[PDB]
């Protein structure tokens, strides 16, 4: 039947503008892990799509008392059929949209420059000399905002009090860790990609929690179950592990 509308956002190495001399248009403009996954799902399920970058360039957060923005809002409003992106599956977003079963699992951890030998978030929580933060209005910020763990409660207090500590996006966050005394609270799979390519960066400690990335849909979407079955089939054959290795494999560090 009709082409589905796919909403997404630029983010390495999930979704990128591929390199070309020509001016690209339509779906051809895109490559990455999420594009490979989307192609595999479209082939398996027999659907076509038109990819659209979400206008406001956000994932989705509950800004107002109630109202959503970003890809989540796009899904709430049925402006897109699918959100294909590293969209973190959270019980709070589940109050507004549905997800497929997760195609990738991960957790929050810390990105930091190699130097002052901290080894945990606790080390970060009990000082202020090293500024730390998260991407504003993202899953990670939301995790801290609503935590009951005292260590993270203290971190939220600092992060929220000083707005100059939250960043607009990953590129701004990574650049800050590279040019200032700044630790970034970031999802582990991105950290893994980054530390492989930036040998002076490292992950501090291990994973704080567990979560996954899933394909977002409007609640009660007829494609949600089909997409889930297909994702689970790919997983049984270790295809998603292979796909990740394809986009993640770096050149390696000293």
Ligand X SMILES: C=C(C)[C@H]1CN[C@H](C(=O)O)[C@H]1CC(=O)O
Q: Annotated binding site for L-glutamate, which residues?
A: 86, 88, 93, 139-140, 187
Q: Using the rule CB under 5 A, which residue among 39, 48, 52, 241 binds K ion?
A: 48
Q: Is 19 in the site for K ion (CB under 5 A)?
A: no
**Is 7 or 69 the residue whose CB approaches Cl ion more closely?**
7
Q: Is 251 in the site for K ion (CB under 5 A)?
A: no
Using CB positions, name the residue nearest to ligand X: 138
139 binds, among K ion, ligand X, Cl ion, none (CB under 5 to 8 A by kind): ligand X
For ligand X, the binding residues in 81-120 under the rule CB under 6 A are: 86-88
**Is 50 or 119 the residue whose CB approaches Cl ion more closely?**
50
Q: How far is the CB of 43 from ligand X (least distance, A)?
A: 26
Q: Is 240 in the site for Cl ion (CB under 5 A)?
A: yes
* 8 A C-beta contact, residue 71 and residue 83: yes
Q: How far is the CB of 138 from Cl ion (least distance, A)?
A: 21
Pick the stretch among 81-89, 171-179, 219-227, 240-248 that binds Cl ion (CB under 5 A): 240-248
Using CB positions, name the residue nearest to Cl ion: 240
Pick the stretch among 19-27, 73-81, 160-168, 192-200 that binds K ion (CB under 5 A): 19-27
Q: Is 225 in the site for Cl ion (CB under 5 A)?
A: no
Count of chain residues binding K ion (CB under 5 A):
2
- The owner of tokens 């190699």 is 114
| Residues in CB range of 219: below 8 A, 6 or more apart | 96, 97, 98
For ligand X, the binding residues in 138-167 under the rule CB under 6 A are: 138-141
Gaps in the chain following residue numbers (C to N > 2.5 A): none
Q: Using the rule CB under 5 A, which residue among 238, 246, 249, 250 binds Cl ion?
A: 238
> In sequence order, what DSSP letters do the residues of the chain get, joined into one string?
-PPEEEEE--BTTTBEEPP-SS---GGGGEESHHHHHHHHHHHHHT--EEEEE-TT-----B-SSS-B-HHHHHHHTTS-SEE-S--B--TTGGGTEEEPSPSEEE-EEEEEES-S---SHHHHHT-SSSEEE-BTTSHHHHHHHT--SHHHHHHHHHHHH-GGGSBSSHHHHHHHHHHSSEEEEEEHHHHHHHHHH-TTEEEES--SS-EEE--EEETT-TTHHHHHHHHHHHHHTTHHHHHHHHHH------
**Is 23 or 164 the residue whose CB approaches Cl ion more closely?**
23
Q: Using the rule CB under 5 A, which residue among 20, 161, 179, 251 binds K ion?
A: 20
Residues of the shown chain interacting with Cl ion in the complex, contacts defined by CB under 5 A: 52-53, 235, 238, 240-241
């Amino acid at each position: 039947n009709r082409s589905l509308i796919v909403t997404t956002l630029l983010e390495e190495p999930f979704v990128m503008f591929r390199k070309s001399d020509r001016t690209l248009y339509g779906n051809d403009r895109f490559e990455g892990y999420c594009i490979d996954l989307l192609k595999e799902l479209a082939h398996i399920l027999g659907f076509s799509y038109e990819i659209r970058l979400v206008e406001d360039g956000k994932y989705g957060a509950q800004d107002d008392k109630g109202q959503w923005n970003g890809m989540v809002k796009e899904l709430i409003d049925h402006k897109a059929d699918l959100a294909v992106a590293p969209l973190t599956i959270t019980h709070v977003r589940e109050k507004a949209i549905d997800f497929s079963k997760p195609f990738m699992t991960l957790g929050v951890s810390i990105l930091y420059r190699k130097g002052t030998p901290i080894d945990s978030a606790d080390d970060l929580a009990k000082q202020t000399k090293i500024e730390y933060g998260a991407v504003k209005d993202g899953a990670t910020m939301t995790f801290f905002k609503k935590s009951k763990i005292s260590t993270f409660e203290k971190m939220w207090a600092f992060m929220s009090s000083k707005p100059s500590a939250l960043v607009k996006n990953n590129e701004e966050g990574i650049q800050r860790t590279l040019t200032a005394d700044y630790a970034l609270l970031m999802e582990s799979t991105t950290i893994e990609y980054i530390t492989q390519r930036n040998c002076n960066l490292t992950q501090i400690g291990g994973l704080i929690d567990s979560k996954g990335y899933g394909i977002g849909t409007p609640m009660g979407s007829p494609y949600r179950d089909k997409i889930t079955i297909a994702i689970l089939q790919l997983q049984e054959e270790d295809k998603l592990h292979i796909m990740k290795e394809k986009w993640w494999r770096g050149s390696g560090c000293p």
